[PDB]
Structures are given as C-alpha cells and as structure tokens.
C-alpha cells in the first residue's frame, strides 16, 4: 500500500462526462492523502457528509468510488443529499444516508467556448425521479403531452437530453463546474483504502 492514490486521474482528467452519463472510477488499495485537496483554494465546494473533512486522513474505508461529471454553477447545490431539482431528480442522486465528499470547481477556462459550448448534456425529461446512484443514459422520446409519439420527435414529443450552452462571459451561476463525488463505503468488511 506504499503507492499513493491516483486522484490525479480523477481531478485532472482530460475529459469529463455529461451529468446524465456520469463516470465512476474504482479506488482501492492506496494511500488516500485527502489533506492536499482540502487545502487547495482552487476548489469552490468541499462538503462532507457522515465524516469530518479535517479528519479524512485518519480514516479507513471498505472501498472508495469517485463519480465525475460537469454541471452548471447554480446546480452544485443539488448534488448534496436530500435535494431536488432537475439534476438531483433526473441526472445524479445522492441518498439521504450519503457518506462521502462532494468536491467541485469552476472550469470556465476549460469547458466554455466563444459562441457557446453545447456538447455537455443533462436529462431534461423523465417519467420518474432517479434512484440514488442510478444512471440513466437512454434516449427514448419523451411524451410531454397527451398525443402518442411513436418515437417521432415533435411538439410535446421531445428528445430527453438538453445542451447546457456554456458561454465564456456567462454569469458565474451559468458557468461550467467539474464535480468529483467521493463515495465512502460503510461496509463492515475489512478496509481497502486508508489515509496516511
């Protein structure tokens, strides 16, 4: 377990996923030095649930999962547990008993583009809300109205995914934010990931 934990492959990844298709990376058998992350002022959000962020190094967990995606600035508050909204209901859901960290930072100099970056997507329509940690990447036509769609796009017959449209001069609330959600395992089995 002498090798450090490769958090660089998560926070400094070249590409980040759309929130509707969030990427999950397995983290195990490593030294998880959480002190350098909490110290860095380049993070806009570092919330912990069930644990203390300053006591993160003194802990051992059964396993560590890292979920990454890109959302809008004013949507970071929806990643927290117990929340509602288009992201918390249709894209990424944390359970009420969530145990882990929510880390996010501003990526306007990476994910914006003159004339708008429209490549990042979120799910705008869904029949029902998401189960915690459920991932829905289907693209079936959504019947918003009463007329059947038969898989044909039209009025009230909509593709479920919508583009974000990140402009370099948007307000901070509309700027892109990369988010890494560290989920800590609560299992009673032997530990796998430990801090120094």
């Amino acid at each position, epitope marked *: 377990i002498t090798n450090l934990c490769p958090f660089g492959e998560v926070f400094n990844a070249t590409r980040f996923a759309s929130v509707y298709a969030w990427n999950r990376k397995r983290i195990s058998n490593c030294v998880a030095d959480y002190s350098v992350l909490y110290n860095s002022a380049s993070f806009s959000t570092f919330k912990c649930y069930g644990v203390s962020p300053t006591k993160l190094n003194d802990l051992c967990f059964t396993n560590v999962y890292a979920d990454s995606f890109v959302i809008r600035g004013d949507e970071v508050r929806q990643i927290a547990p117990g929340q509602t909204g288009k992201i918390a209901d249709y894209n990424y859901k944390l359970p009420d008993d969530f145990t882990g960290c929510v880390i996010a930072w501003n990526s306007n100099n990476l994910d914006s583009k003159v004339g708008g970056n429209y490549n990042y*997507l979120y799910r705008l329509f869904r029949k029902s809300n998401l189960k915690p940690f459920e991932r829905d990447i289907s693209t079936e036509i959504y019947q918003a109205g009463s007329t059947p769609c038969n898989g044909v796009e*039209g009025f009230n017959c*909509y593709f479920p995914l919508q583009s974000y449209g990140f402009q370099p001069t948007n307000g901070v609330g509309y700027q892109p934010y990369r988010v890494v959600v560290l989920s800590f395992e609560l299992l009673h089995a032997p530990a796998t990931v430990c801090g120094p």
Partner: antibody
Amino acid sequence: QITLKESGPTLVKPTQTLTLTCSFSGFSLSTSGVGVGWIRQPPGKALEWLALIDWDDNKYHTTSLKTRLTISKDTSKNQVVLTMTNMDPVDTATYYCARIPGFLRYRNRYYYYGMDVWGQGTTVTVSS
Amino acid sequence: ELVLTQPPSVSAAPGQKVTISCSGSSSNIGNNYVSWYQQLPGTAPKLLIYDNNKRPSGIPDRFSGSKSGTSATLGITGLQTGDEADYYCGTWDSSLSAGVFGGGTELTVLG
C-alpha cells in the same frame, strides 16, 4: 389564453438605443422548452426574426444584428426586455414579441415549434 | 438576403384551391420543422401550421401543410374573400443558430 404586450418608445433619434419590454400572461418562462421571441416588420416588407430568449436563459440572435441586440428575462415579473443599439432610420418597423411553446437543443439538433402567440406589436420610428 | 424563398404573389377565384411554396436549404427546412403564418392587413401574424402539417386549435381543414426535402407548401382550398392576406413560412436555421421567415406571399382572391 396567452396574451403578450410590447411597450416602449415610438420615436427614437438615430444612434440612440431602443429598449422594448414584452409583458405576457397565460404561461410561464420557468416551463421547460418555452421561450419568448422578437420579430420586426418594416412598413410594407417581410417579417424579420430578431432574437429569442430561452427558459434556461439561452439566447439566440439574428447573425447580422447580434452585435446590436441584447435580450434578458425576469421570470417573476413575466417580462422579457430587448435592447437594440445604434438605431438607424431603416430600423423603422413594427416590433413584435411572441411565445415559442417548444424550443430545445441537443448538440447540433434543434426542435423549434415556431411562434404560436404573437403580441399586438408596437411601431418604432427612427428619425432625426 | 433571404434564406427562404416564397413567390411574391398568388391568386385564384373563390372556392378554388391555391398553394404557396417555400424553398430553403438543408440548414433550415431540410432538417427543421416548418410553420406557416397568416397576416391580414393591419394586424399581427397568426400561426396557421406547425410541425409541417399540424393545425392549432381554431384553424379549419381548409388549410394544410406539407414538406418534402428542402421545400414546404401551404395549401388553401375553398377560398373566401376573407382569406386575402400575406402568408409566411418560418423555421429554424441550424447554420445561423436563429429563426428565419420567408419573404411572404400576398394572396389575392379574385372576386
């Protein structure tokens, strides 16, 4: 029913800025897929699409006029505001707003219903 | 210039059928839904057709729409004198990232 009403000056001096407000009733700009558009029509000429503001605050503009057009919304007041800078006599037209009941974008693909409900229209004359 | 082309005028007798055409590129009509509008003299436009061929509530069977390739057509049967108006096609243009209106067609009912 839907009802939109435009308001603003009816006579502006050349090079001044025109500010138009669209007040609407019967729908909400908080609804997914709904936008408010602007159109103008010079005397005896065709309709000219101007701009659109989106429920998610996306903004689109006619390309030849983008550097002159600003659009914004206030969902709580049911109002959209369009400003056009550097007004010329050729900008003398009747200006409309209208509801876009369906406008969505997925990367390169669009759904754009059109304009199902138009306002009365206000006539702006630019003259020195 | 205009990216949608309409004939400037079209005429027929009462009770007859008239068609108004609208041609564009694949950037607009070819890949996006076409809507048609009627504008009586002195008033605001009024939506006649949406999604190429659907009518909103209050529009009679006399108006129909079609789209093939990069062209759309508005058909009006059983012409009445009250149908004299300018008619426009509209759609979204993916290249301009904006909406476009055709030049408009003035319908004359020969009575």
